[PDB]
Symmetry: C5
Subunit: 334 residues, 5 copies
């Protein structure tokens, strides 16, 4: 029996190695396999990865006439001491178990141990949509010991920044992913003390040009279309009136359709400001002709008892104001 080469019943494996003395160092490496999904309304993401641990325990040393190591599956985990890592700020997680538990232990003759398992985790990520669609988001995954303070267990990245590897074809459908790196920081709990925490950081971006074509283009086109009435004969009322009202209807169907396709986030974003300002422009172009038609009728009635000046000024004033608004908007939102 291989479990008799390790004197399992001769030691108390409910206490850590080096109990009573300096803290035992534990090194960690991570390999990220994929990014599975992201939820903008609930503000979280899901990832699948491999987690590896490295430490030394003299109680597991065994004699050997060679330098070969012994390998075990997850059934041995319940008989020895192992570190208790958990994921901070997570919502759910599980360990894969097909066709059996995805766990491995390798023991060197001198007592060095490698501990490897495959896991899937869902973690929270606070997001800010004020600058949508030109927003940038930063996310992280955090690892910590549940019950051991820094006086008993010292947790660190085994090879610094070389301890993190990512798959060559990692991707998300609606985002671009960049800038993976690691950091560390100490955390304080009033109930028990100080703990060391490890982080994995990355950044997300959208495809701007899609949103530009999809949203900003049609609104600008309809605003330019509403200016055509300034060049039409003012005597053609049955042509001037339906044009304006139909332009208003069209802008409304555009805005409704654009709403239906964005994530349901109930506060003001940049693209709403652009859309609503454009709608106000279309509205004012209808009031302009109402004033022209009333003044012309008044003059004709007075007389019985050429281009109007308002059209001449509007032809210049409307585009300049729209250009100025665009300059200010794009200087503010980049």
């Amino acid at each position: 029996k291989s479990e008799q080469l390790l004197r399992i019943d001769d030691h108390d494996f409910s206490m850590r190695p080096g109990f009573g003395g300096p803290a035992i160092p534990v090194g960690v490496d991570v390999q990220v396999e994929s990014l599975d999904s992201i939820s903008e309304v609930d503000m979280d993401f899901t990832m699948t990865l491999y987690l590896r641990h490295y430490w030394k325990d003299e109680r597991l040393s065994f004699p050997s006439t060679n330098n070969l190591s012994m390998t075990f599956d997850g059934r041995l985990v319940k008989k020895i001491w192992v570190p208790d890592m958990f994921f901070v700020h997570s919502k759910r997680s599980f360990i894969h178990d097909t066709t059996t538990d995805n766990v491995m232990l390798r023991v060197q003759p001198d007592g060095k141990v490698l501990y490897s398992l495959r896991v899937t985790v869902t973690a929270m990520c606070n997001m800010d949509f004020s600058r949508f669609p030109l927003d940038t988001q930063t996310c992280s995954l955090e690892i910590e010991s549940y019950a051991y303070t820094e006086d008993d267990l010292m947790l660190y990245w085994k090879k610094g920044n070389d301890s993190l590897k990512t798959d060559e074809r990692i991707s998300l459908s609606q985002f671009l992913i960049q800038e993976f790196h690691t950091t560390t920081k100490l955390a304080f709990y009033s109930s028990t003390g100080w703990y060391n925490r490890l982080y994995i950081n990355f950044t997300l971006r959208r495809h701007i040009f899609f949103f530009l074509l999809q949203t900003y283009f049609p609104a600008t086109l309809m605003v330019m279309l509403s200016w055509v009435s300034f060049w039409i004969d003012r005597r053609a009322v049955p042509a001037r009136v339906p044009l304006g009202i139909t332009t208003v209807l069209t802008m409304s169907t555009i805005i409704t359709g654009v709403n239906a396709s964005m994530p349901r986030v109930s506060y003001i974003k940049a693209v709403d400001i652009y859309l609503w300002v454009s709608f106000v422009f279309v509205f004012l172009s209808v009031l302009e002709y109402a004033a022209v038609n009333y003044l012309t009728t008044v003059q004709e009635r007075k007389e019985q008892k050429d281009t109007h000046a308002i059209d001449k000024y509007s032809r210049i004033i409307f585009p300049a104001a729209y250009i100025l608004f665009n300059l200010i908007y794009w200087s503010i939102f980049s």
Copy 2:
């Protein structure tokens, strides 16, 4: 073996400490990690937190030449007595178990015990949408002992209002969160007796200005647009008629689009009252011109065999009535 320092087989751990006598006090602290989601149709919310217990048991005392405590994981829980807390009015819950069970026990030399675990819970919350979007909601989470009355177990907040801590970046996508505090109250069951219950309370609010721009603005604009026809020559029938009917169509597409984007709650809310009143105003503006055109045709036919008075009065009467409705509405709904 550390489990031999506690005389586990020398006591009956199916009975509480102090059995036969006064009730044993149990103190509680809570740390809230995040708010995960909220469902308006099903009327519930989900939260993740840390739950800590504190009590004393002389049967767990052990000799020591120092003042160091002993720490255990969840495997010891099945060998000793622990309190049986459950969440009242909950729909589902679970205890996190990656990479192992997220449970800890710490025992002092004199028998003081700390019991800590990490849990996620979904709880009901009755909501009232009568004043939407200007509504305010209050929610709570409740903690109680399943099997012990106040004569056997006395449950209380360990440090009063200082027993509740919340994470600095707690947030929801569509709500603002304020005013966390704790309370206590006694509850009666006819089957078994009196129990003490603990509460955690908080309040939610919406972003009003978003809904104002999104809903109230376009309806007011279309109502003002329908008044333009009062200043148009009454002889231009092919201009007057299509304007009114197209305004009605536009208001209808607005209302349908607004419905499609609100939570599916099938009873009357304030924003429906505003929308429907606006639609009635647009409808009456079309009936006005129908009457004008009939009367003018009658006069002309009679004669063969200037502004009409109705337009002159409507130009004044319609805006005043709308302003009065707005005053009453906003005095009622704040």
Copy 3:
């Protein structure tokens, strides 16, 4: 050890109390905590409740110098006999287990037993939507023994109609709930025999006035709007034609929007009949003017080589027919 006061190893707890003789009576009480959700497409509902059992077993009697009872958690259930209740016509269910199993047993000195647990269940409910939105639905939850016929186990409500209690704030978002009561009935299985079954019954209703404002109001308004053309000068073709076609478009957008918001039930309901009849009325008003314009052109051409009679009759005939349809419809559907 408290489990030595009951002679657990001196009896066979795989057989019922009173084996060999008359059936053992078992009384039941129920406390309903909440109604969690309802699904109209799948035709089911979900509820959370407390279930309590009461029976006597002389094998559990123990000596005592007082009249105090002993209390146990779920770990004792596997050592003694307990009744095997299940829910008939259910789709899924589970027993709550945070922070431990929500089960309790209380044993009197003379052998009386109380057995209490907390459970959540999803059950089927056949619904009929023919009269929507004026429909009424009735639902039930059923309880039965899996393996014991009425010759071995007699199941009954412990206190008649007083055995059912409901929470003071039970509610659903889209329904009104009334008329809770209990009944009993015997059921026959050809495989094994007769069993007694218990029922919990209640009734659901909708908020009619919401649906009236939301659906019936706009359709009636558009039907009345289509009658305006009967009072317009027949010589104004470019006013008469676009009015009718735009009214048809508006009614179509209303019907599409109303469909998008009802539960996806693919058979004919009352509100469809009202909507479709209204659409036919709008369609006939356009055919009326087509006939008028053709006849007028024919007369003018014939002559070269006042109000038309059709308008005069339509002005009377259309509203009377619509009023008659409304009388018949509302006498049929209440």
Copy 4:
């Protein structure tokens, strides 16, 4: 102890009854409780049922002074041999376990056994939507032994066609259900051999008249509406043009709305053919007037330097072609 009446430790219950000799016959009965849901996109359905087995084992015989049988719950299943049935072509399944495992065993004095359990299963069903909404679908559920060939275990329906019972109120929301019956057939696996398989078959149909009113009615009405322009004075251009373009818009909103409400199946179905043909008819009616107006203008200009023949022919030709298309369509698709 009742488990000592059966000599459990005197036999090897890892081998079947009659090992070494002819195959042991096993009879099956099924009672269907409900049909829970159906998914058209994923092509599967879900059902809840009772499954009963019947066989004889002389090793379970026990002495008795009467003819009474002994009943056990699921805990005895792990101590004796039982048949290993599984569901072929299923996606998920589970056995109900509230308030305990829904399993029963009944043993006669002579060794006859009844084995009963309650289960829910989701199974695949390939569907063909070519004839939608006039399609018909056939589904089945299949039962088979996992590890025993027909040489060791003989599986059959216990009472032929009388072995299948269905609940009196079984129903689905969007389908009609008819024609339950059973069959059997032998299956071959190259890895191990021949196995006998049992089937349960049934058929589904839709409510045609709903779809007729919902889809075919409005399209026919708009096609008939487009024919009105053939009777309108050709000199009234501002009446003829907007009518046609608005009819095209209305047909487009109808088709979009109809798409939004059908299951997302991305290939051509019959109702698409009808809709698209109707749209082509509306399109050609606009080209007709374009040609009329150009020819009239040419004639007038030529002259300066009554009904047109095209209208007269169109008034006859358009309805006849539409009627012929309808005859062919409904002779093809029934």
Copy 5:
């Protein structure tokens, strides 16, 4: 007892067969039962299959007077050594367990073993939608040993390309499936070494003709409809203007409706390019008439103080440009 024919307690089944020496070969066969679902947004698919293993172990040999083998269920798996296969790049998986665990073991007298189980797996698949709806996708499922390198375990397809079988009625609702085959490749891990990996490959395609009718047809029809105004009398302003604006509205409702029905993938696809170009064409046709009407009014006013040339050129220039765009587009995207 059959488990005494195999000397289970006389061997250490924590080490592989042939420990210390050359690697043990393990052959694999796969039978695919169904394809359950596919998710385009999350980029994964789900499949149900049978997995079979074949190897030899002299420790399991037993005496026999015949050539009959012994069969066991999953309970024996925990007592002997078996291979530890897992699925690479998977998101979740499970082993079916109704009515018991779907596992089988068959042992020959000479120690040959067959190991069979039924499993369902969800696996990732990166997709590219640039050419939608004319895109083609390739997917794979991968199998690998968790803990044994190629020096200890040699994994291979048992019968080459004949080791893969697929069900005769495998299908997906929205895709066509072709070209199943197998491959193998060696993989390197810096943590432990080289491993052999097996692949199952297949290809997916869409139904093009559906998308052609659904999207490309209406846009082309509306572009052709906008050309009608070039043949209309330029003096009929109240006919020319509403036609153009209504055509713009119709194209907008078409594009919105087409968006609502495609998978929510936020980057530019081919069908967007076609739609947006068509919209620009419709927009330019309105600017054309605006210029014509202004120039005509200028000429008339100048004079007071036939076909216009622009119409004559547009009648030729617009269709040629559209045909050229179509030629380039369909030469690029096939």
